[PDB]
Each structure stands twice: as structure tokens, then as C-alpha cells.
């Protein structure tokens, strides 16, 4: 069936759906043997959901969008081998393994182009131009329409009608400020961020009435006069105002204490989860810690069981760690292999416990 929501829980068929999922942004660039590998590793590790990239703006070997300097147009790549046909294959192997997909449709940062690609090529100078500019928004829309409407060239199923897809995410980790190539206006706020989130999620809802929609943000709050950047709306994001939109089915938050300098031993991280589990309880919508990570094996064996035990007790709908590694590699520091010896205590113990719930 299609993944649904019933109050604070995700639901699949008649039953509530608690899970540990994972990330593999790199599925869009992986060879077929490795796309298959991801899903069989996930399966035996007891992971039923994976979050991954469905945006790729540029002119490398794989691209989904790209600016045409001759045509003055943002053009889309339907190619079997260099473009969206790669997504078709991902959805196919996912469905073959009874695994579900969270597709993120854009990115805040400059990895694989993201928002800044739109801003550069349309003539904008500010990152948050993407949040207001009607011309830029219409290019994001036409892309969304194309992706949701696409027929799967291997299975004949339109994306919007595909039960294999868990749900759509607007963009990865939106802030007012990006990677650095383009700065933020004084014009950007929590009002502007939230309104952009509103109409894009509504635009998704008008085409696709089967799937869930979320933002894919880090989960930053806008609570007046709280201490940290992640709680006081300094980022220009407002988790509360996002989760309050009827156009958003579930809330998303990320956990990166090292990047945010919150100490990889203290109580801030546990408090961070609890705080989002409370927002799940206080509004009546599921929330997912869809990204979390620690830079070292030793940090992960230390804190993952703690964080995961929090997710269990707080009754958080689900969580997805960053990130699974195929081929087996440390990758960016956060890469976890299924071949890892301590996989049970980093990943496995928790996956079963969410499966059981």
C-alpha cells in the first residue's frame, strides 16, 4: 500500500509503522551492481526505508537538470543511462526488495548543484532568491511536475502512483544561508522560508494525492529567546510553523552535534531528540530523525545506542542514520558498512526494535 499517517504514527496498511531507515544520497550515481547491493545490505540489516537524492544539477556524467545557454532554458534529462532512467532502476530494485524510498527534490548546499544552480543561471545574487523569485520557483515547479508525472520506463508506473515511494521532500536542509557562493538577503526570514515551503508542498499535493510530503530540513526551531542557533530561529527556519501546515504530512529533523559544536558526549543531543519527539506528540504528526551521524566508529558505538534508546522511549515515529556505505568505505567519515563487525550495536539492534514496535 501507500505509506500513510495516523496521528503521531506512520502507517502501512492497517498497522503502525516504526522503522530505522538509512541514507544513500549516492544511489543516483552508483552502478547497477551497487544499487542492488545497497538494497540487499539494507534488507539483511532490517532496514525497510532509504532516503536519497532525486536532484542533480550540472554537467557531469549523471545529471537530471542543467542550464542551456543556447536555449535560455532549464532542461531536464530523461536519458536511460545519464538521467532519470537511473531513478527508474532505483525504484525497481527498491520495489523488488520491499524497500521504500524518500526522494529529496532539491538541496540547500552546493552538492550536486542544489538551489544555488537555479540562482546563478537565472540571474539571482542571493541564496534566498530561490524562496521568492517567481521565475526560479516556476522552474522548480516544472521539475517537480516532471518527476511526479514520469512513467517508470522499466515498470510502467508513474512516480506519483508508485507505492514504492515513501514520500517527497521539498529540499535538503533549507536555511536562509547556503554553501557560500551566494549570500543571504536581509529579506529572508522565518515568514519567507515557511511561505515558500507552504506553496511548494501545496504544489506537490495538487499533482500527487497518494504520497506524503515533508521538507527534509534539519529541524531547526523558531522559539523566541532560546539559547542556541538550532532553537531560536537564527537559521531562518521554523519547525513549528512547518509541522503546522496541512500540506506537510510528517516533520523531519537531523542530528549533527560535531558540525553544530554541541559536544559528542553531553546531554544536548538526547535533549534534541526528546524535543522533536515532543513536537510529534504536541502536534499530531509523525516526526523522523532522518539524518544522524557521528564522525568516528568509537563515537557511534558510544552514542548511537543512547540516541536510539531515546527514540524508542520517546516513541518517535522513525529515524534514519547517515549513512550506509556501498562499496564498503569510511566515505565522508559517517559511512557504515553492513560488513562492519559492530553493526548490531550501531544499526541492527535498533532496526529490529523499531520493526517489532
Instruction: Tell me the structure's resolution in angstroms, rounded to a single decimal.
Output: 2.3
Q: Which of 169, 173, 218, 290 is catalytic?
A: 173
What is the C-alpha separation between 166 and 147, in angstroms, rounded?
15
Question: How many domains in the chain?
Answer: 1
CATH of the domain at 147: 3.20.20.80
Sorted by sequence, the CB contacts under 8 Å of residue 206 that are 6+ apart come out as none
116, 175 in Cβ contact below 8 A?
A: no
Q: Which of 169, 230, 290, 291 is catalytic?
A: 291
What is the C-alpha separation between 357 and 355, in angstroms, rounded?
6
How was it solved? X-ray
What pairing do the DSSP bridges indicate for beta strands 19-23 and 165-169? unpaired
Would you state the cell numbers that stand for residue 268, as one nine-digit string? 544536548
Locate cell 500500500: which residue? 1
Sorted by sequence, the CB contacts under 8 Å of residue 190 that are 6+ apart come out as 222, 233, 236, 237, 238, 241
Cα 138 from chain centroid (whole Å)? 22
Would you state the cell numbers that stand for residue 235, as one nine-digit string? 537559521
What is the C-alpha separation between 273 and 14, in angstroms, rounded?
27
Which structural domain, as residue segments, surrounds residue 33? 1-357
Q: SS3 for the chain, per residue?
A: CCCEEECCEEEECCEECCEEEEECHHHHHCCHHHHHHHHHHHHHHCCCEEEEECCCECCCCCCCEEEECCCCEEEECCCCCCCCHHHHHHHHHHHHCCCEEEEECCECCCCCCHHHHHHHHHCCCCHHHHHCCHHHHHHHHHHHHHHHHCECCCCCCEHHHCCCEEEEECCECCCCCCCCCCCCCCCCCHHHHHHHHHHHHHHHHHHCCCCEEECCCCCCCECCCCCCCCCECCCCCCHHHHHCCCCCCCEEEEECCCCCCCCCCCCHHHHHHHHHHHHHHHCCCCEEEEEECCCCHHHHHHHHHHHHHHHHHCCCCEEEECCECCCCCCCCCCCECCCCCCHHHHHHHHHHHHHHC
173 is a catalytic site residue: yes
What is the C-alpha separation between 83 and 88, in angstroms, rounded?
10
291 is a catalytic site residue: yes
Amino acid at each position: 500500500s501507500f505509506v500513510q499517517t495516523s496521528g503521531p504514527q506512520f502507517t502501512l496498511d492497517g498497522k503502525p509503522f516504526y522503522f530505522e531507515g538509512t541514507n544513500a544520497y549516492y544511489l543516483m550515481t552508483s552502478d547497477q551492481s551497487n544499487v542492488k547491493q545497497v538494497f540487499s545490505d539494507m534488507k539483511s540489516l532490517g532496514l525497510p526505508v532509504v532516503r536519497t537524492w532525486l536532484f542533480n544539477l550540472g554537467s557531469d556524467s549523471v545529471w537530471f537538470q542543467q542550464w542551456d545557454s543556447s536555449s535560455n532554458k532549464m532542461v531536464i534529462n530523461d536519458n536511460s543511462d545519464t538521467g532519470l532512467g537511473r531513478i527508474d532502476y532505483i525504484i525497481q530494485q527498491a520495489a523488488s526488495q520491499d524497500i521504500k524510498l524518500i526522494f529529496t527534490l532539491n538541496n540547500n548546499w552546493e552538492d550536486y548543484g542544489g538551489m544555488d544552480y537555479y540562482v546563478k543561471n537565472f540571474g539571482g545574487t542571493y541564496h534566498d532568491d530561490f524562496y521568492t523569485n517567481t521565475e526560479m520557483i516556476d522552474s522548480f515547479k516544472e521539475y517537480i511536475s516532471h518527476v511526479l508525472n514520469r512513467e517508470n520506463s522499466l515498470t510502467g508506473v508513474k512516480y506519483k502512483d508508485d507505492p514504492t515511494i515513501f514520500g517527497w521532500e521539498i529540499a535538503n536542509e533549507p536555511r536562509c544561508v547556503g554553501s557560500g557562493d551566494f549570500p543571504a538577503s536581509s529579506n529572508c526570514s522565518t515568514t519567507v522560508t515557511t511561505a515558500w515551503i507552504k506553496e511548494i508542498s501545496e504544489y506537490i499535493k495538487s499533482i500527487d494525492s497518494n504520497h506524503l510530503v515533508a521538507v527534509g530540513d534539519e529541524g531547526f526551531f523558531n522559539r523566541k529567546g532560546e539559547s542556541d542557533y538550532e532553537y531560536n530561529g537564527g537559521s531562518g527556519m521554523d519547525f513549528d510553523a512547518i509541522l503546522a501546515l496541512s500540506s506537510i504530512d510528517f516533520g523531519t529533523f537531523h542530528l549533527y552535534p560535531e558540525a553544530w559544536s554541541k559536544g559528542t558526549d553531553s546531554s544536548w543531543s538526547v535533549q534534541w531528540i526528546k524535543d522533536h519527539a515532543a513536537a510529534q506528540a504536541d502536534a499530531d504528526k509523525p516526526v523522523i530523525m532522518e539524518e544522524y551521524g557521528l564522525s568516528t566508529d568509537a563515537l557511534r558505538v558510544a552514542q548511537y545506542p543512547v540516541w536510539q534508546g531515546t527514540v524508542e522511549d520517546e516513541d518517535l515515529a522513525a529515524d534514519a542514520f547517515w549513512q550506509i556505505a556501498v562499496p564498503c568505505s569510511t566515505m565522508d567519515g559517517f559511512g557504515i558498512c553492513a560488513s562492519d563487525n559492530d553493526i548490531a550495536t550501531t544499526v541492527t539492534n535498533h532496526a529490529d526494535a523499531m520493526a517489532k514496535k
